């Protein structure tokens, strides 16, 4: 008559992720409909269909003067906790996890006078050297050149290239898996204005859209606040 | 989600005959074939297709002289722990149990000189009186007469007759269920020889084959050794 | 309503080989593909399709001089922990277990000058005597003769012959189940060279391939290191 069973040693323990609920103490509670639009099932979803300003210096944009040329314009170690990619949606989302596998996109919204032209260059430096510091060094890598004047912004896709199928959403001392490299933009042509008088500098917004192959795997509690 | 159960009071107890095994700690152990003949599934089986010498006096046989006649030749209280039926296979098997329901067979292998004849009588005395002690008393019961000379042995089936469907594999103080009676053999004709000189006595083996309707039910541990 | 159950006495115990896993605390973890070739499911597999040098003296080979003849060349008690078969893949695999049931193969890679010939004899001595010590004694058993010169190596299959369906992967004091015998090779013709000057000795490699009917059954923890 009575069934025969054996408790596992574990048995009367907790389990903070038991695939299966608990005992339904209140029942039959019918719930009212919801008419609110702008709903979501997936979080990656929102960061793909939405950019966020990267924080260069304390602002979300770099400058372009008619006295630049050689010098780098913008640089940062492509890892989801590198300075610039700190305040972004896409990067702040990440920290509920441990891993990402995606190439990112950036959009350069030039905001200088409508009598200003700046022309220009972006470059992705895979990890190896110790940060090229002149386009003449950087142009020998993957780069794109762009001429503001009629465009009114631009887009560059920093891909995913590495031996590991997933990388780290957390930066740390130089590993083959932390760093994916740098992202760089250069003054391929020092800015110009109707008068150097009226128009001193031009600027450019650096917006970060999640790439089209990007995804976060593995949820993880939050460490300490540092 | 979690199923609702209730342990019986018994619960975390032993049970030395739980119809169901235990946890298989080693698995997939394929086992090699067996080519040995003379195998068995059932124990009754072996005692049916096999006799065993009953121990009369300390030997498995009685005598037959040309000076007998009246006197009984062999007698024993038909119960599976009566003297003679002590050393037999059929009787020694029994004690792993508590009950039997079978009529027994006995075979009388006469071993006297080939110049000897003995003629003779067997008799089954159901329980009632206090042991008839002369054939003239015993022949009025169920008996069989046999003449050695050309036979070279004989067989007598001591049946099962009693009000209970099973009896006791263990003998005890006179009960309606212990004793099934006696088994007796008589000198219906005192032995004869070529010369009383050469051939003094003849003998006869008393072999016990399990009957054809005999069976043991109920296993039981062994008491003390007595 | 509530189901009735009864815990076995065992119940809240360990079990280091419970045929059944545990509670899945992390779920839905999709895993990336693997493109690495040279993969395996079964361990016997690798030792069958792969030899390993037996360690004679401290080296994996014996010699052949033009001064031998009678004397044995190589000998060892065919049991998976006998000296020579100590360093081999096939023998070192074994010790995760307790039993084997296979005939072994050996390959004799002769390495002497290309101006050298050695001719020769191998022999398997089933267990009985106390090690024959001259071919004249050994040739009366199962043996094979081989002539280097154009061959460039040789193969001998030491079979499985014994009353037990599985033997011991662990050697111990003389048992009917430990020892399967000896393996012997002889100088059926003392070596020869262009000049006894240039070519002194010839050698021969003793490689051990798992036999074609060989298998290990029963995993077992490792004892002490001795």
């Amino acid at each position: 008559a009575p069934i025969r069973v054996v408790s596992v040693p574990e048995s009367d323990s907790f389990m903070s992720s038991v695939p299966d609920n608990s005992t339904p103490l209140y029942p039959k509670v019918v719930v009212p409909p919801r008419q609110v639009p702008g709903r979501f099932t997936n979080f990656i979803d929102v960061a793909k269909q939405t950019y966020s300003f990267c924080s260069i210096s304390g602002k979300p944009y770099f400058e372009v003067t008619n006295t630049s040329g050689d010098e780098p314009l913008f640089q940062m170690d492509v890892s989801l906790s590198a300075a610039e990619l700190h305040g972004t949606y896409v990067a702040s989302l990440s920290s509920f996890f441990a891993q990402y596998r995606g190439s990112l996109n950036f959009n350069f919204i030039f905001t200088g006078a409508a009598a200003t032209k700046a022309k220009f260059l972006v470059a992705f430096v895979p990890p190896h050297s110790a940060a090229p510091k002149t386009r003449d060094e950087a142009m020998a890598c993957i780069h794109a050149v762009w001429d503001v004047g009629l465009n009114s912004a631009f887009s560059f896709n920093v891909p995913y290239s590495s031996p590991a199928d997933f990388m780290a959403v957390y930066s740390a001392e130089a590993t083959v898996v932390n760093v994916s490299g740098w992202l760089q933009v250069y003054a391929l042509t020092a800015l110009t204005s109707t008068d150097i008088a009226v128009n001193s500098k031009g600027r450019v917004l650096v917006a970060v859209s999640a790439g089209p192959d990007f995804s976060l795997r593995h949820p993880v509690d939050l460490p300490d606040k540092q | 989600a979690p199923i609702r159960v209730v342990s019986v009071p018994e619960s975390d107890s032993f049970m030395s005959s739980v119809p169901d095994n235990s946890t298989p700690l080693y698995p997939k152990v394929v086992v090699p074939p067996r080519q040995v003949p003379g195998r068995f599934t059932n124990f009754i089986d072996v005692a049916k297709q096999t006799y065993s010498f009953c121990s009369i006096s300390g030997k498995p046989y009685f005598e037959v002289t040309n000076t007998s006649g009246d006197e009984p030749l062999f007698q024993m209280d038909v119960s599976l722990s009566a003297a003679e039926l002590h050393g037999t296979y059929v009787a020694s098997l029994s004690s792993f149990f508590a009950q039997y329901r079978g009529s027994l067979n006995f075979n009388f292998i006469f071993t006297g000189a080939a110049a000897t004849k003995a003629k003779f009588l067997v008799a089954f005395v159901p329980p009632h009186s206090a042991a008839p002690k002369t054939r003239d008393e015993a022949m009025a019961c169920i008996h069989a007469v046999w003449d050695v000379g050309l036979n070279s042995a004989f067989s007598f089936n001591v049946p099962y007759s009693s009000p209970a469907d099973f009896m006791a594999v263990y003998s005890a103080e006179a009960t309606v269920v212990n004793v099934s009676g006696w088994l007796q053999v008589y000198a219906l004709t005192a032995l004869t020889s070529t010369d009383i000189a050469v051939n003094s006595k003849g003998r006869v083996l008393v072999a016990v084959s399990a009957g054809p309707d005999f069976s043991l039910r109920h296993p039981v541990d062994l008491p003390d050794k007595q | 309503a509530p189901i009735r159950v009864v815990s076995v006495p065992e119940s809240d115990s360990f079990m280091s080989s419970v045929p059944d896993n545990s509670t899945p605390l992390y779920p839905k973890v999709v895993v990336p593909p693997r493109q690495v070739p040279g993969r395996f499911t079964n361990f016997i597999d690798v030792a069958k399709q792969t030899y390993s040098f037996c360690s004679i003296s401290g080296k994996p080979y014996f010699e052949v001089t033009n001064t031998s003849g009678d004397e044995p060349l190589f000998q060892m008690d065919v049991s998976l922990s006998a000296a020579e078969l100590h360093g081999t893949y096939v023998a070192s695999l074994s010790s995760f277990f307790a039993q084997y049931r296979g005939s072994l193969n050996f390959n004799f890679i002769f390495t002497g000058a290309a101006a050298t010939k050695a001719k020769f004899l191998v022999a398997f001595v089933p267990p009985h005597s106390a090690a024959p010590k001259t071919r004249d004694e050994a040739m009366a058993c199962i043996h094979a003769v081989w002539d280097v010169g154009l061959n460039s190596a040789f193969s001998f299959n030491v079979p499985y012959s014994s009353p037990a369906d599985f033997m011991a992967v662990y050697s111990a004091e003389a048992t009917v189940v430990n020892v399967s015998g000896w393996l012997q090779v002889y100088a059926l013709t003392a070596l020869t060279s262009t000049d006894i000057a240039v070519n002194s000795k010839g050698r021969v490699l003793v490689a051990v391939s798992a036999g074609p009917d060989f298998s290990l059954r029963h995993p077992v923890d490792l004892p002490d290191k001795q």
Binding site: P19, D20, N21, P24, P27, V30, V31, R34 | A1 | -
Partner: peptide, 21 residues
């Protein structure tokens, strides 16, 4: 969501959870 055990519906979905419309 994280309930991939075939015992979750011991309590039918009325008692289990809620309902919309």
């Amino acid at each position: 969501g994280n309930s991939g055990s075939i015992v979750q519906n011991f309590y039918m979905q009325q008692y289990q959870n809620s309902i919309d419309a």
